[PDB]
Amino acid sequence: VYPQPKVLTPSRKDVLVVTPWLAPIVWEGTFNIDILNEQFRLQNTTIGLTVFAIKKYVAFLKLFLETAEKHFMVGHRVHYYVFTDQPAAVPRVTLGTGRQLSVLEVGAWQDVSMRRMEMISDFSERRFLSEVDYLVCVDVDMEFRDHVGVEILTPLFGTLHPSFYGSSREAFTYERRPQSQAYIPKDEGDFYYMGAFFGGSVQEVQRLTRACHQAMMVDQANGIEAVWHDESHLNKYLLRHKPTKVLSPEYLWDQQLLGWPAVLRKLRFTAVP
Amino acid sequence: VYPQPKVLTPSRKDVLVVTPWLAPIVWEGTFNIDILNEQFRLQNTTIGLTVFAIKKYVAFLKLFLETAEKHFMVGHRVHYYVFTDQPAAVPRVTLGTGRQLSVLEVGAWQDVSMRRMEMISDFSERRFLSEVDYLVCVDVDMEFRDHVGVEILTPLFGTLHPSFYGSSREAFTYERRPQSQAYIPKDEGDFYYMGAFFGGSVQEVQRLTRACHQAMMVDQANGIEAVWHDESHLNKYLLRHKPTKVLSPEYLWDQQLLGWPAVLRKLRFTAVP
Ligand SMILES: CCCCCCO[C@@H]1O[C@H](CO)[C@H](O)[C@H](O)[C@H]1O[C@@H]1O[C@@H](C)[C@@H](O)[C@@H](O)[C@@H]1O
Numbered sequence A, B: 001v002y003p004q005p006k007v008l009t010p011s012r013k014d015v016l017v018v019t020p021w022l023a024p025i026v027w028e029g030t031f032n033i034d035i036l037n038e039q040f041r042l043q044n045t046t047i048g049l050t051v052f053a054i055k056k057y058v059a060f061l062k063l064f065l066e067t068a069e070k071h072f073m074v075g076h077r078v079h080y081y082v083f084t085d086q087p088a089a090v091p092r093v094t095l096g097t098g099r100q101l102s103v104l105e106v107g108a109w110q111d112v113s114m115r116r117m118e119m120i121s122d123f124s125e126r127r128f129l130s131e132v133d134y135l136v137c138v139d140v141d142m143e144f145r146d147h148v149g150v151e152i153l154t155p156l157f158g159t160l161h162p163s164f165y166g167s168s169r170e171a172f173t174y175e176r177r178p179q180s181q182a183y184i185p186k187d188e189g190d191f192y193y194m195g196a197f198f199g200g201s202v203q204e205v206q207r208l209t210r211a212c213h214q215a216m217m218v219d220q221a222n223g224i225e226a227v228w229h230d231e232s233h234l235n236k237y238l239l240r241h242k243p244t245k246v247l248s249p250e251y252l253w254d255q256q257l258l259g260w261p262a263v264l265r266k267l268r269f270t271a272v273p
């Protein structure tokens, strides 16, 4: 039993909650988590979370994982995959039942710019992910402050960049040179998505990360680096293959930079100052 | 090129546009048809529409089909399947390119109450629907007045009953006897869906119509007829298997009964007076 939805009452009066292609934009007040948790638990949903922690960023893993255990997908099956050049430096964090962590070592400047999309592409294709239903790909220099759960899950999602959710499209920092595979013309574009939080089913994350990696290789062969690297390619991809959910900036925020505006009812996953 | 969606501007301020399980509720102003038409045409989407026209209701087929040709899925591949006890009386209506019609003869009072779900179940399982991607199941005593297009398409959809979209759940005319397979308790239920317009992918319409038919057979064996026949079973089904889109009453209206309220910007598919 849960409160009856009310057809004549908007779920939010201050923000857009569905895109023009009918993908939900996920804000607090738009979902009932009990119904979603039931639907996803009925499928024994397993969520993989990938995170890169390279060089001095390995220091952010302790708080990232401690707070993920408090707030990410609690009650569902979770497997963290930590990609790092220092596997020995991964903190031993105690995990709830049904949750596990694997450490994946990274080897070996444009190839580093390509590393995230290349490595997730290769990894997402492996047979040991047979049990994993969705992949969520986030940055490590962050903490969870509030619920991040199965409301986000869908075949393909991106996240509204916290600096640009209010901007008109010509102000978006899309790649603007026609020479680059990431090019988006002045008059095109739905949203500016941030590279720090995207995901989807395993098949849709294989497709996204393969397309971004292959596009970046083409740019490198031509001597061009997109203005915001794999984020520029992510935006080009999501423009052409529209996400089936879009996460609001509740899911990717910087409070030191941007404070706490009235349109954010919760700050769920935030930059570490 | 299309107008940029505006994150800080609700798509509607007067109605709920997403359910608590994050399924879009389809109202005018919530979608951009050009983007949807592109996505669906890229998949060469074929829509089957089923309609029953029995005894004197065969008289409603001429206006139903003439207006469907003006307003239903125009530009996409459509196949009408007319189920009738008078195949000879089906009007010869001229169809646009890419659109065809087949006539399916019905044979042979509780078995008539079961006929729609039984017949669609049997039909949806046939190999000649290999090319068909979605099934839309509507009543014949209706006309199209305005656009009904691929915005509705999704794995599973129901339609808000025009008499009840404003009602609280205890006022819903759900089956209330625990003896019936359609039973829904006082404190349960999201919406009251009408049996006159439901649909989804072929697989989801096989599942819905098989479950409703099998449930109604169980009730008949027990000497119970649900209060609103297959509509009572439809509601029980959609309560347990939540629809991935819900159509607003723009898609199922009676203007003689209910007029033209401010929350309806378009009257798309309406009862014939
Ligand atoms: C003091 C730096 C403020 C920069 C705000 C704009 O954010 C940056 O936007 C570009 C695209 O234009 C990239 O997405 C870049 O990674 C963003 O900066 C990072 O995210 C912001 C929100 C803030 O946390 C910065 O400190 C990060 O470097």
Ligand SMILES: CCCCCCO[C@@H]1O[C@H](CO)[C@H](O)[C@H](O)[C@H]1O[C@@H]1O[C@@H](C)[C@@H](O)[C@@H](O)[C@@H]1O
Pocket (backbone or CB within 6 Å): B161, B162, B163, B173, B194, B195, B228, B231, B254, B257, B271
């Ligand atoms: C004069 C009759 C007014 C009835 C309004 C309520 O609609 C009926 O609701 C039940 C469930 O409670 C069934 O869904 C039934 O089929 C509905 O009646 C039909 O639809 C209404 C909207 C109107 O067009 C009636 O004339 C139909 O019989």
